[PDB]
Structure 1
Amino acid sequence: EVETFAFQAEIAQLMSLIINTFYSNKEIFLRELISNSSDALDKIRYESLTDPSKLDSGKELHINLIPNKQDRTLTIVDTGIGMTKADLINNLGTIAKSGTKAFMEALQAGADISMIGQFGVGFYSAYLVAEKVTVITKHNDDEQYAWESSAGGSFTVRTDTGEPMGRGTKVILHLKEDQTEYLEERRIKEIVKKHSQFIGYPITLFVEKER
């Protein structure tokens, strides 16, 4: 049981600009995904202060970066608050619509793609490097879901039958064939050091064993 939704035309127009751009500083996608994870971890931590039971689904607060050269995927995993079905299909899109509208005008104006996160559409910077993004998430108040889009005008949402995650989010970047540098340990280390090492949670870059 998979539900397929259309994006509104202006969002669809932004995702196409992003997926098609030759903008050179594409490393900024990683800062944006890590920032979302950090926000998600803050959110559940600030919630846990009054209601301690909000961490029964996992005490550990961390971010893991998981390259897989075999599958050409970079996965960003966190144990933050996660997202509900209603977040994925409704609440997040309200912010995306408002953020999109504005950013598309600043782009006309001659603003830089790296300020995408200022307008709350930083998530879409994934398409700088990915042909498809799969978001698998578990919020305390809902079941485990997978959102996915290839920036083709639509996204799907389905119950995720896969491995239970407890609480948190995995963003799986199915990388563009010309963007495989983002699977190299040397490259990921460089970006995290430049853009993300002052994040307030441990970021663990996983190494791969022999194929």
Structure 2
Amino acid sequence: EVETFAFQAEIAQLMSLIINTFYSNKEIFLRELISNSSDALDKIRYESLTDPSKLDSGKELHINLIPNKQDRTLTIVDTGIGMTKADLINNLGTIAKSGTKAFMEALQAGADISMIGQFGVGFYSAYLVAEKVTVITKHNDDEQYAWESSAGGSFTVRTDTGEPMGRGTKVILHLKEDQTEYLEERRIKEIVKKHSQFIGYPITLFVEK
């Protein structure tokens, strides 16, 4: 069964902005999503310090980038803490209502879209380059869920029946037709080296057939 939810008004407004503002420096989406994955990895690492059984669902802590030119998707996988159903519904574990307010005021006071991550809502930068985003996640305390939104004011949550993940989060970006440069291995490596050079977890860029 699929449950459909309305976004809180502030988040709908953040998304509509991101989608409809002119802003050429779109590559920052990948920095923000890698940063989110790094934070999720830090969280499960910290919990495992006093309860090593937290890593029974997977001891490897890493980030994988998977381009797929056939489906026009870029997938970011981490083996971090994952999200419960409650986390998903509550704006993917963010304080997005208050963060959106602070971000929109910073914009009028001379901030630009690339500072989105400082306000805790960097996930939504995915919509600079994606027509739809699918999030598959598994937390130790819950089942595997799929979240999906094409913007337009709603999101869906369902129990995921695909391949089990163990623990972590898979963010699947369905790229806009004119944003396929982010499927190119050269372009991805340029962005990672420019913006994510000092992330403290291995980042593997998968190759295509």
Query: What TM-score bracket applies, with the shorter chain setting the length?
Result: over 0.9
8 Å contact kept, 1:21–1:128: no
Distance 1:174 1:97, change over 3 A: same
In the superposition, relative to structure 1, how do residues 77 and 92 fare at CA in structure 2: closer, same or farther (>3 Å)?
closer
Write the distance in 1 (CA, Å) between the matches of 2:141 and 2:151: 28
SS of 2:93's equivalent? helix
Residue 119 of structure 1 corresponds to 119
Deviations along 1:110-138, one digit per CA (max 9) or x if unpaired, are: 31101000000000000011011100000
Paired residue secondary structure (2:164): coil
* Contact residue 132 and residue 148 of structure 1 kept, 8 A: yes
More displaced stretch, 117-126 vs 87-96: 87-96
Contact 2:84 2:142 in 1 (8 A): yes
Mapped to 1, the partners of 2:175 and 2:19 lie a distance apart of 11
Give the direction of change, closer, same or farther, for the CA distance of 1:91–1:128 in structure 2 (3 Å limit). closer
Residue ranges of structure 2 left out of the alignment (5+ in a row): none
8 Å contact 2:94–2:120 — kept in the other structure? Answer: no
Kindly state the Cα deviation for residue 90 of structure 1 after the two structures are TM-superposed: 2.4
Moved more, 12-21 or 75-84: 12-21
Partner of 2:158: 158
The 3 A distance-change label for structure 1 pair 34 and 137 is: same
Residue deviations 1:132-161 (CA, integer Å, cap 9, x gap):
110000001100001111111111111001
CA–CA distance in 2 between the matches of 1:90 and 1:111?
26
How far apart are residue 22 of structure 1 and its match? 2.2
Q: 1:93 to 1:200 in 2, by over 3 A?
A: closer
Matched-pair contact (CA < 8 Å) for 2:83–2:93: no
Distance in 1 (CA, whole Å) between partners of 2:116 and 2:49 is 31
TM-score normalised by the chain length of structure 2: 0.97
**Following TM superposition, by how much is the alpha carbon of 1:197 offset from its aligned partner in structure 2, in angstroms?**
1.8
Q: Deviations over 1:80-136 (max 9, x none)?
A: 000000100126466011111121122223311010000000000000110111000
Distance 1:36 1:27 in 2: 15
CA separation of 1:6 and 1:27: change in aligned 2, threshold 3 A: same
In 2: Cα distance, 1:3 partner to 1:181 partner: 34
Q: Under a length normalisation based on structure 1, what TM-score does the superposition of the two structures give?
A: 0.96
Alpha-carbon separation, structure 2, partners of 1:59 and 1:146: 23
**Counterpart Cα distance in 1 of 2:121 and 2:108:** 17
Alignment partners' CA distance in 2, 1:17 and 1:10: 11
Deviates more, 1:7-16 or 1:164-173: 7-16
Residues of 1 paired with 2:200 and 2:93: CA distance?
A: 27
Percent sequence identity is 100
The question of whether the paired residues in 2 share the 8 Å contact of 1:65 and 1:206 is answered with yes
1:26-73 deviations in Å (ceiling 9; x for gaps): 100001100010111110001001000000001110000000000000
Give the paired residue count.
209
CA RMSD of aligned residues (A): 1.1
Contact 2:102 / 2:119 at 8 angstroms: preserved in 1?
yes
Q: Verify the 8 A CA contact 1:19 1:131 in the aligned structure 2.
A: no
CA contact (8 A) 2:83 2:92 kept: no
Q: Call closer, same or farther: CA 1:75–1:94 in 2, change over 3 Å.
A: closer
Q: In the TM superposition, what is the alpha-carbon distance from 1:11 to its structure 2 partner?
A: 1.2
